[PDB]
Amino acid sequence: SLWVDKYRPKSLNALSHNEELTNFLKSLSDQPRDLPHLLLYGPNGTGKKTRCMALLESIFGPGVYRLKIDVRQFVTASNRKLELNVVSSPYHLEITPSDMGNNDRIVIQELLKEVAQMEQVDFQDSKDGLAHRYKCVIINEANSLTKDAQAALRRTMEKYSKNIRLIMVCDSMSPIIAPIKSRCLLIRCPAPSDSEISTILSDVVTNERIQLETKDILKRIAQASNGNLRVSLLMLESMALNNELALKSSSPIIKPDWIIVIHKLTRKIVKERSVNSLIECRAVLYDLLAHCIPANIILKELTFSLLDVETLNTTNKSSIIEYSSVFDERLSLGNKAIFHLEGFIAKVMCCLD
Amino acid sequence: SKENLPWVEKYRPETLDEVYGQNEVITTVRKFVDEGKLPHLLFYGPPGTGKTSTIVALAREIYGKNYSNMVLELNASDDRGIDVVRNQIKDFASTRQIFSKGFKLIILDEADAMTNAAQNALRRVIERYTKNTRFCVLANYAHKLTPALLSRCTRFRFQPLPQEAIERRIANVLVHEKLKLSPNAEKALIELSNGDMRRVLNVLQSCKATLDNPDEDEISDDVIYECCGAPRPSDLKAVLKSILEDDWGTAHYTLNKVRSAKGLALIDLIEGIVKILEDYELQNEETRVHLLTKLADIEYSISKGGNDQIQGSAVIGAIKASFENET
Amino acid sequence: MKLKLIVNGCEAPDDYKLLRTTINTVASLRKTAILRFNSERLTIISTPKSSLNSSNNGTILRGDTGQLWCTIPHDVFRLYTVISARELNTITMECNCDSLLSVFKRYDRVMNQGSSSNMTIKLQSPICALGITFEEIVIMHSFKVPVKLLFRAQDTRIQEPMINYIQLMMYKLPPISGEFGSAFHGFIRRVERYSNVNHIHLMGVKDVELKIIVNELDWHLEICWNGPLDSVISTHEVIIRCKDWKVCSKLYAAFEEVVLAISHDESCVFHCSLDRGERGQIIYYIARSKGL
Amino acid sequence: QQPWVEKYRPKNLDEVTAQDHAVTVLKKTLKSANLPHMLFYGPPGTGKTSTILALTKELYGPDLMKSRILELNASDERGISIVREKVKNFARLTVSKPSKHDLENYPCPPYKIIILDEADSMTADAQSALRRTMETYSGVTRFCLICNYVTRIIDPLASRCSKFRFKALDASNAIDRLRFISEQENVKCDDGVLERILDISAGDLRRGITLLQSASKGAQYLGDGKNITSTQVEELAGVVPHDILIEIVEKVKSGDFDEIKKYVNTFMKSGWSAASVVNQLHEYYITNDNFDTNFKNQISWLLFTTDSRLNNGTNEHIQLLNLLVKISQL
Amino acid sequence: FSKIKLPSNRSILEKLQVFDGDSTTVIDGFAVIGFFDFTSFDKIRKSTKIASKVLFRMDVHGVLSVNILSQPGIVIEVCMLEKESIDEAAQTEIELLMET
Numbered sequence A: 001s002l003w004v005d006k007y008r009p010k011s012l013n014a015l016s017h018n019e020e021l022t023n024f025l026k027s028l029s030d031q032p033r034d035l036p037h038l039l040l041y042g043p044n045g046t047g048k049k050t051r052c053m054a055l056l057e058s059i060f061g062p063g064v065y066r067l068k069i070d071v072r073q074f075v076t077a078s079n080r081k082l083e084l085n086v087v088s089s090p091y092h093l094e095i096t097p098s099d100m101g102n103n104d105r106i107v108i109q110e111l112l113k114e115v116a117q118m119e120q121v122d123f124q125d126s127k128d129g130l131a132h133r134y135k136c137v138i139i140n141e142a143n144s145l146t147k148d149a150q151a152a153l154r155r156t157m158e159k160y161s162k163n164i165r166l167i168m169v170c171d172s173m174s175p176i177i178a179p180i181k182s183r184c185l186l187i188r189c190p191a192p193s194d195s196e197i198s199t200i201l202s203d204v205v206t207n208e209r210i211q212l213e214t215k216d217i218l219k220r221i222a223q224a225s226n227g228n229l230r231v232s233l234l235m236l237e238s239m240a241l242n243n244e245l246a247l248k249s250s251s252p253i254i255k256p257d258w259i260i261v262i263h264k265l266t267r268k269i270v271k272e273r274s275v276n277s278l279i280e281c282r283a284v285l286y287d288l289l290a291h292c293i294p295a296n297i298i299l300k301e302l303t304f305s306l307l308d309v310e311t312l313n314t315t316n317k318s319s320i321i322e323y324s325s326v327f328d329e330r331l332s333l334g335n336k337a338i339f340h341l342e343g344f345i346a347k348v349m350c351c352l353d
Numbered sequence B: 001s002k003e004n005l006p007w008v009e010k011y012r013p014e015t016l017d018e019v020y021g022q023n024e025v026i027t028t029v030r031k032f033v034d035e036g037k038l039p040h041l042l043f044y045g046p047p048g049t050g051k052t053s054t055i056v057a058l059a060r061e062i063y064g065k066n067y068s069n070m071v072l073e074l075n076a077s078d079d080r081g082i083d084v085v086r087n088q089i090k091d092f093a094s095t096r097q098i099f100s101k102g103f104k105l106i107i108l109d110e111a112d113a114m115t116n117a118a119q120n121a122l123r124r125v126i127e128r129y130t131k132n133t134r135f136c137v138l139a140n141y142a143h144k145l146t147p148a149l150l151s152r153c154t155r156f157r158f159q160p161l162p163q164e165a166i167e168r169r170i171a172n173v174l175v176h177e178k179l180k181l182s183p184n185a186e187k188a189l190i191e192l193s194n195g196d197m198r199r200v201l202n203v204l205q206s207c208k209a210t211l212d213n214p215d216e217d218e219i220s221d222d223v224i225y226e227c228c229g230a231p232r233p234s235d236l237k238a239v240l241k242s243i244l245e246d247d248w249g250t251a252h253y254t255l256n257k258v259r260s261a262k263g264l265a266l267i268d269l270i271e272g273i274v275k276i277l278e279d280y281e282l283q284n285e286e287t288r289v290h291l292l293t294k295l296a297d298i299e300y301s302i303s304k305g306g307n308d309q310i311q312g313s314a315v316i317g318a319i320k321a322s323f324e325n326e327t
Numbered sequence C: 001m002k003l004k005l006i007v008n009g010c011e012a013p014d015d016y017k018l019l020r021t022t023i024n025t026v027a028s029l030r031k032t033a034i035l036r037f038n039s040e041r042l043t044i045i046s047t048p049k050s051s052l053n054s055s056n057n058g059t060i061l062r063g064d065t066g067q068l069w070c071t072i073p074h075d076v077f078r079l080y081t082v083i084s085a086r087e088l089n090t091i092t093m094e095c096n097c098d099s100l101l102s103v104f105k106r107y108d109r110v111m112n113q114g115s116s117s118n119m120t121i122k123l124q125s126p127i128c129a130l131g132i133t134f135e136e137i138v139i140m141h142s143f144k145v146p147v148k149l150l151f152r153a154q155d156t157r158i159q160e161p162m163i164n165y166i167q168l169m170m171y172k173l174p175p176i177s178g179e180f181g182s183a184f185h186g187f188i189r190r191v192e193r194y195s196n197v198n199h200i201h202l203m204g205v206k207d208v209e210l211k212i213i214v215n216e217l218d219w220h221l222e223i224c225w226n227g228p229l230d231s232v233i234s235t236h237e238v239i240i241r242c243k244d245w246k247v248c249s250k251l252y253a254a255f256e257e258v259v260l261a262i263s264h265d266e267s268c269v270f271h272c273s274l275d276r277g278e279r280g281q282i283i284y285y286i287a288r289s290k291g292l
Numbered sequence D: 001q002q003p004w005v006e007k008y009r010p011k012n013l014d015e016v017t018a019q020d021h022a023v024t025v026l027k028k029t030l031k032s033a034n035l036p037h038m039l040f041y042g043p044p045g046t047g048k049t050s051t052i053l054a055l056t057k058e059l060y061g062p063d064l065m066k067s068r069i070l071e072l073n074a075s076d077e078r079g080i081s082i083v084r085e086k087v088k089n090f091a092r093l094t095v096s097k098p099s100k101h102d103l104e105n106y107p108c109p110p111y112k113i114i115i116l117d118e119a120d121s122m123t124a125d126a127q128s129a130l131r132r133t134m135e136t137y138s139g140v141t142r143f144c145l146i147c148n149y150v151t152r153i154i155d156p157l158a159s160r161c162s163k164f165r166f167k168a169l170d171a172s173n174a175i176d177r178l179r180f181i182s183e184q185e186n187v188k189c190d191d192g193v194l195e196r197i198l199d200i201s202a203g204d205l206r207r208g209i210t211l212l213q214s215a216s217k218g219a220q221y222l223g224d225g226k227n228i229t230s231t232q233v234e235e236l237a238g239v240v241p242h243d244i245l246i247e248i249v250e251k252v253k254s255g256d257f258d259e260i261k262k263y264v265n266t267f268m269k270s271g272w273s274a275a276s277v278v279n280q281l282h283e284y285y286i287t288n289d290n291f292d293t294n295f296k297n298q299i300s301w302l303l304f305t306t307d308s309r310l311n312n313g314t315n316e317h318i319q320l321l322n323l324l325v326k327i328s329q330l
Numbered sequence E: 001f002s003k004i005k006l007p008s009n010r011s012i013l014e015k016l017q018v019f020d021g022d023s024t025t026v027i028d029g030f031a032v033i034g035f036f037d038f039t040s041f042d043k044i045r046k047s048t049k050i051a052s053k054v055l056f057r058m059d060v061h062g063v064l065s066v067n068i069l070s071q072p073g074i075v076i077e078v079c080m081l082e083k084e085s086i087d088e089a090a091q092t093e094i095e096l097l098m099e100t
């Protein structure tokens, strides 16, 4: 398997990147009967899902990693077979309602309500139990729920709290409505420091010999990962296999292709500011959108690449960030992203000229 | 049976003499009934003005005890699609009236929720069977009605209830419920009514429930404000004075103290300050433009939630910055 | 681990039905089965709490908490030789019910074709195979159904549920061969003509009266029984599923001494038996699906 | 046993704290039989659902509740067909006969209650199809609408429903209820705590109860027998430490775009919520006496715009950087 | 324009009696005509299937009272309203058709 999954902490004691967070998780798992609904939020790739699985392993014991995929089928108002994969475990369930689109309301209203209605009585056990009495449902990407699946959950996880518990993983919990955040215990997961990422990469290159020339090459990957442990571990494997398992100080850091294309677009915007350049930028944006890359991330990386240009004055950057905020708000409240993604670029070139 | 009913349903008018506020519409429909020729009617107005109470009392006056078999009342609670119009309404209009009261009456309550196909199909049922049936259309929004349907209907506008009508109905309610109301409490109730009798009755019922002893006790303005959770007329003036005269720390303290005194929300304070600043003699024409535009955005943001303290500070800053233009 | 046995259907016409009822009801219940070949009693076990390869998503996404615990005496088979180093020569296995049930259908049909040939079951050497062999009357049929050798520690985790008797009231269901048997079978399966019923509210009021209440329709339906019912030994009620009642319908149709055990809002136990003469008792433990 | 938010849910109407203007009115309807149509609106976690659940119990009893109550929430479909068929047929239903025990123990009003919780998520047509349903069968069926945004309820429906505003639960009206829960659970806290919890939880008792439960679960895990301090409460509530906020305002005061951008980039990695740092900056800037009237007037609108954009589900990094750049140029 | 004529024989039509709107004065040479929608008129078709005798009565108010007696047995009473007939040429065409 990939080094991101192979070297994954499978227990609460194997976590080694945040210790004030691991202690809070141990405090939560000490008495699992009264565990409230949890909402883990933080940057992407910090280890939020790994920590959720480690907490579930501390609560229900080993075996929560024995995952099987049970394909479900749903029908909306106008008869149409809509399919959702449900990765399930003998003690917990993982669902991604965002994968089915705007119709995640029917998934939340049927699957989650049917799970929350089954008491999970098992053999007797009608009094209580630390495990196997209540159930854990993991809702990955809680941010992409379309404000109606979040309304069907407010009473679902409140009335049926005795037989079900929810642990939802999310980043930047702004599009999560206030009633959902009120019913839940907010758990902040900070990103690992560069020293911690370097230590984890050192452990990886110790278990698998890649012949590290200098400890600085692991630090460069950590600084290029911007706090993303999964990305850092992916670039480690990339520069490992692309250099015959021998990392040198001159080894280039491999970055995603869409990031390079966004940087090229930024340089084109800085160099050429005209209508035809705007049309070429629209072609680049369409090509980027054809790869199912979300438009908010396109705008975010484009803005933070334009703010890194050394030939731009402070007045230009203060206008770029303002246009970025305005068009991000427009993109959030919109249907088609090309209009806003082109308007931001047009205003940027109209300001830089 | 009628004593276990909400006051908005217990005090529903049964005759045309109990409908107050709308004098020109009643004095016209009564003559229409007296001559016996009732045209196709259209009742338009704000909610809680007395359109349904008027049309049901009118039908009772025309038909007496035959209201059951002579009046077809279809509203938003029943399906009123193209098939319903083409079958139920058409066979009700086409069949005879057993020579009971001459013409039939079809009351289409909440016709603004009706689809355009049904309203277009009803045009040749309204003007074809008009000899034996008459249509009454009750609506609150005239933009959802087709222009032809508006053309084939005599439009009567139900104005918001005047203060005198509210006082006359409040007197009857107080006499029936053996309740006492101070003049200032009546003033507060009428200003909070906004031309709605249902709100008046709902607030009066809560005020009676609020009293420890329903008799020998008078409902004051304090009781009404406590029950409905509205700011007193002095709290709004104090907040506005603190914002307009005091500095940014004292105004922030005064707003928070006033709100925490009685758990006052920000939206009612915003509306009260808007109403107080409406009769202000501004002299710049930009103070009003900035005030209305900023307060409307704050009001819209409150409707979608957010941080309350930030919105209160935004109100204070908007007023302070808009009044910088005036001087 | 030496496990060998021979079954001949013609000599005893009751023990073959006893075994067929287990092999069919376990296959209908869930995938694969446990066969505990003790030195004197065979214990076919179907449980979601274990089974090793039948404990995937049992009481997780379908509410399958039903546990069947049957018992086959050693006198059923013709030769009962069990050799194992475990306690009382215990040999616990786990094989699928598909191949085993198909093989039993083939053997039963071979019998229906007019044959007297026996069947030989062996264990041809922790994963093994079952050497089922028989013939017509000299066509050869060999079926090496895969099987495993689930450990003694894993065996110990498989314990029969302990049913209390503080509030339990037994109900002696009438024999199917009797006059009231067909009527009672029809009353049992009467709840199956409504395709939108998922839960069944059993009720017994003490001459006991057995009542079935359905509250999942626009109307309130109560399926009652005015016939004679015996209580071997206050209203005790339990809400169970519909498939758990269908399997009980089949068990009642396949047996005579059937006891309906009802725990108040706790469980429902369907105790079947076959007094051959020790006794091949079939016990199904069903848990409440909802609260009263 | 259960989470403290579910263990301490008000069972009767006397356990609902800080909302007396509505509970006093509702208690009077127990002796009478003139309960009106009700519209419960207010901030989240104020006790709107618990109040109606306690009123329903006190009015009917657990046996008559199953027959005299229909509750529809956002977890089930409430379209035009559901409203025009299921709700209308339940309103048209006949009031069931109360039992002798029910009539001798509970008031048993001669009507049923239809509770439509989370009514703000219903469409304008499903709400329009409810007006005559409530009006025609008001003598046999009562309606209770629960919502957080009263603007999402149409004016015709709001006119027919008696409006009950649930006040935000602050440290002045929920401190006794929080102290009761602390005492029954034997939670040891320093002086000042249980007020910082209610200050962080702006108008929400559910979040404060969950915060206290989380603090206790760490307090008994440490095993030192020491009182819970406000620092731990702020740490596990997501509140940014004051040193980091002072660093933010010092970086803002310099006004250099690049250093503020780098600090925001290294701050977003710590996982802090934008709605919390913006709120803390609001308290820092508005209450400070080192800023003039013009600066406060401008920054009030800047913070309002940032909060409004953040509430719409936008990127926190971009909004926070733009806000700090705008303050740096004020 | 199709017509179904019930026989004047006393086994099918046992008794036909036309009055001048008072159910007492039997007159001859004048016919009563009732305009009905067959959607309402077909509602009695499932009741005439088990009917031994059917009694038809109509007044001047345009109400047809269909009386169906089955053989003891169930007694069925269906009352039906008559259309406006706003067009007054079909009446004369009915008269011409019956005279034809």
Ligand SMILES: Nc1ncnc2c1ncn2[C@@H]1O[C@H](COP(=O)(O)OP(=O)(O)OP(O)(O)=S)[C@@H](O)[C@H]1O
Residues within 6 Å of the ligand: B007, B008, B009, B010, B011, B012, B013, B018, B019, B020, B021, B022, B045, B046, B047, B048, B049, B050, B051, B052, B053, B054, B139, B140, B169, B197, B198, D156, D159
């Ligand atoms: N003029 C009036 N005189 C007395 N009571 C009135 C009057 N207008 C309204 N009411 C009261 O308000 C209640 C509601 O008014 P309705 O006439 O039923 O509805 P409406 O005024 O037509 O508004 P909409 O469009 O239906 S929401 C009535 O049942 C009365 O109790």
Ligand SMILES: Nc1ncnc2c1ncn2[C@@H]1O[C@H](COP(=O)(O)OP(=O)(O)OP(O)(O)=S)[C@@H](O)[C@H]1O
Residues within 6 Å of the ligand: A154, A179, A182, D004, D005, D006, D008, D009, D010, D015, D016, D017, D018, D019, D043, D044, D045, D046, D047, D048, D049, D050, D051, D147, D148, D169, D177, D205, D206, D209
């Ligand atoms: N006045 C109060 N007294 C006691 N507990 C309260 C009070 N208000 C809220 N709570 C607690 O807050 C938690 C949730 O209350 P609910 O009423 O169910 O939520 P809510 O007010 O409906 O908010 P929603 O569902 O987001 S609209 C429970 O644990 C209640 O005990």
Ligand SMILES: Nc1ncnc2c1ncn2[C@@H]1O[C@H](COP(=O)(O)OP(=O)(O)O)[C@@H](O)[C@H]1O
Residues within 6 Å of the ligand: A003, A004, A005, A007, A008, A009, A014, A015, A016, A017, A018, A043, A044, A045, A046, A047, A048, A049, A050, A051, A169, A200, A229, A230
């Ligand atoms: N404490 C840790 N030690 C070693 N590796 C870790 C640790 N935390 C996270 N990782 C690595 O990070 C990778 C991705 O983390 P992930 O769970 O996807 O984070 P998030 O949930 O924030 O997306 C995992 O493959 C795991 O190997």
Ligand SMILES: [Mg+2]
Residues within 6 Å of the ligand: B051, B052, B109, B138
């Ligand atoms: Mg009306």
Ligand SMILES: [Mg+2]
Residues within 6 Å of the ligand: D048, D049, D117
């Ligand atoms: Mg609620």
